């Protein structure tokens, strides 16, 4: 029973769910007498396609819009491989069994009427996986529960997210860059790689193997005159020396080894860097934000909240939170439309240069001996 | 009337898009255009045709 309006909601539980009855279909690893195990999988193909579960009211294209529009875009992610391991040191005399499985993403679309809810479509999305693991010796008996489970549930902090359906600067006339910083994500968890849970003793790890060199840049202009993605890049590229936009070869891991009495819950994002391209003149008069990729972020939750109650939030207003260092570091840069005229001889004192209609012009010179001119 | 029996539509419409390629060096050879000249012949003769 749900304390909101009438009509139709997008609602998110987020990320941490398993399945029931999917333990131990990925398999096992026994590891004895002071060994080390690693066990893992890489999020790519055959295994990150979304279970849908509709209802005549929502069928899977009204899901998957609905989602998409204001959750993470899966589908674009489908195809841009995620790798992740747990590691798990056995001790000096005993076995250890460690079994995997997989953790999904919930989302559900809902009708609300009188407040209480009367249809439910279900979204699971593959996100990352889940090692259970214990220390045994043989006749043991263990409980059902560790291997079986009857329902789904929420390993990880439960929510409710939903939405409802419907200075002075002294600087001269020109052209500017201004770097803001690196660390930037997107509102709603739109950016987010994913989430794992380590146990007592364990080490996980998330790696972007950049088995595929694509990437996601986001552009947004206040005047699609004068200014465009190509536009945009080249000054880039003028300005920092930018030479890849779309691509990149390089590759960031988080790894954290959870203490031996407590859990441990890592979430990896990827972030962005912002550059702004304004064209101060006597007074901001256009800008531009271009986000380049950067190497991701981590944040680390030491345990879970104890559980207390499921309390429902609105999703934030779409926009974007830095988590980086703040800095600001700006170039200028040379206007296209002005010609520049190159001086083939080096310039000594007392020299004359003729001017050579009413338009702007560059002329590029350097000095023969240090000095004041 | 049963060539085409075999593809299945709805699988191909899941596929994903190709979004990075692997390129071949040499997959372009060269074009050549094909030049052909007309001839004409007159055959004279008194039984019209």
Not at chain 1, 1 to 23: C, E, K, P
Not at chain 1, 308 to 320: H, L
Request: proline content about 5%.
């Amino acid at each position: 029973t749900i304390d909101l309006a009438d009509g139709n909601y997008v609602v998110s539980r987020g990320d941490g769910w398993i399945l029931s009855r999917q333990n131990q279909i990925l398999g096992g690893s026994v590891i004895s007498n002071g060994s080390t195990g690693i066990v893992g999988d890489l999020r790519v193909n055959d295994n990150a396609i979304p279970y849908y579960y509709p209802t005549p009211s929502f069928n899977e294209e009204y899901i998957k819009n609905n989602i998409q529009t204001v959750f993470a875009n899966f589908t674009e992610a489908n195809q841009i491989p995620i790798g992740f391991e747990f590691s798990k040191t056995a001790p000096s005399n005993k076995n250890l069994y460690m079994y995997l499985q997989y953790t999904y993403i919930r989302y559900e679309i809902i009708k609300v009427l009188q407040h209480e809810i009367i249809e439910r479509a279900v979204l699971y999305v593959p996100s990352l996986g889940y090692v259970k693991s214990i220390e045994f010796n043989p006749g043991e008996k263990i409980n059902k529960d560790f291997y079986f489970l009857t329902n789904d549930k929420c390993i990880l902090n439960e929510q409710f997210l939903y939405k409802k359906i419907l200075r002075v600067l002294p600087y001269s006339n020109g052209l500017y860059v201004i770097n803001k910083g690196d660390g930037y994500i997107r509102t709603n968890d739109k950016d987010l790689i994913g989430t794992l849970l380590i146990e007592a003793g364990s080490s996980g790890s998330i790696i972007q193997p950049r088995l595929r060199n694509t990437t996601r840049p986001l552009f947004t202009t206040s005047n699609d005159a004068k200014f465009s993605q190509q536009y945009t890049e080249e000054r880039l590229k003028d300005a920092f020396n930018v030479q890849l936009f779309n691509t990149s070869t390089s590759l960031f891991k988080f790894v954290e080894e959870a203490p031996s009495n407590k859990n441990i819950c890592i979430k990896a994002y990827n972030t962005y860097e912002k550059y702004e391209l304004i064209d101060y003149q006597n007074s901001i008069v256009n800008k531009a934000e271009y986000y380049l990729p950067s190497l991701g972020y981590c944040e680390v939750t030491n345990a879970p909240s104890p559980e207390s109650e499921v309390v429902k939030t609105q999703v934030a207003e779409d926009g974007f939170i830095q988590n980086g260092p703040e800095e600001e570091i700006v170039v200028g840069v040379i206007d296209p439309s002005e010609n520049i005229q190159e001086i083939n001889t080096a310039i000594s004192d007392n020299y004359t240069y003729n001017i050579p209609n009413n338009n702007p012009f560059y002329i590029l010179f350097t000095v023969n001996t240090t000095g004041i001119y | 009337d049963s060539s085409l029996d075999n593809v299945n539509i709805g699988v191909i419409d899941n596929i994903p898009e190709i979004i990075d390629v692997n390129p071949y060096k040499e997959n372009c050879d060269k074009f050549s255009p094909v030049q052909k000249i007309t001839s004409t012949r007159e055959i004279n003769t008194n039984i019209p045709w």
